[PDB]
């Protein structure tokens, strides 16, 4: 049913979005706050980026889009200390995904 899952990431992403915890995920990191980011990161992900693979119909499976969603917080954690305010936010956005992603019965 590639309309209702079109809607359901939709709706899911545009609550992840409003999370307030989602601040350091909404853009691309720039090699100004990060230089050495897209060596380290290879898979590189954010929410505006999502947005856009959303819009243009590139996550055809619920997996690709969760595969999306979990990177971004799995790249936080290989970038960053594990003790840092990225980390916390990451944990804190994950925590409510997981609860959003539950809700609309997209993992058990
Ligand atoms: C686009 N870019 C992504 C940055 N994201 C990011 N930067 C770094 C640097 C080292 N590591 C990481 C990391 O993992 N991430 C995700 C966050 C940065 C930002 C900074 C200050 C803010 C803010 C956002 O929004 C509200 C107010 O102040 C915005």
């Known amino acids: 049913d590639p309309d209702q899952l079109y809607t359901t990431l939709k709706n899911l992403l545009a609550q ?3 999370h307030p915890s989602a601040w350091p995920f909404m853009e691309p990191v720039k090699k100004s706050e990060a230089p050495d980011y ?3 990161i290879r898979f590189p992900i954010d ?5 856009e693979r959303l819009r243009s119909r590139y996550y055809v499976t619920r997996k690709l889009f969760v595969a ?9 954690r290989e970038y960053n200390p594990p003790d840092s305010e990225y980390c ?3 944990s804190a956005l ?3 995904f997981y609860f959003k992603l539950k809700e609309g019965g997209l993992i058990d």
């Open 47 to 51: 929410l505006k980026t999502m947005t």
């Open 68 to 76: 999306d969603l979990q990177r971004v917080i799995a790249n936080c």
């Open 38 to 40: 897209y060596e380290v």
């Open 94 to 96: 994950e925590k409510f």
């Open 16 to 18: 992840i979005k409003s």
């Open 88 to 90: 916390r936010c990451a």
